[PDB]
Symmetry: C4
Subunit: 33 residues, 4 copies
């Protein structure tokens, strides 16, 4: 269960690192001159 | 507790997959031609 | 440890539900007519 | 494993607190008068 939980957390972290790679689309829609 | 924790993680993942489905509203407010 | 972990997850969920209440500021900056 | 899991959660929380410090860039791109 423990090393299942840990390898859900390393799914959550690799979602967050998708969400950051959306936020850095959004910041670059909102742009360089 | 373990398979409670795991089924909080599968609540966290199904929040993140709401947050992604806000980010993909925001990116499509910021739009197609 | 288990019911510590679970009550970090219920900290993570109550962050996500701050992050959603930023996203629903951002969507309402981006607005009603 | 438990106090490994807990110290992934305190990695997740310190990601979320990066994501909040992007959202508060985005809200301040979208600005003060």
């Amino acid at each position: 269960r423990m090393k299942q939980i840990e390898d859900k957390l390393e799914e959550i972290l690799x979602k967050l690192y998708h969400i950051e790679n959306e936020l850095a689309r959004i910041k670059k829609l909102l742009x360089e001159r």
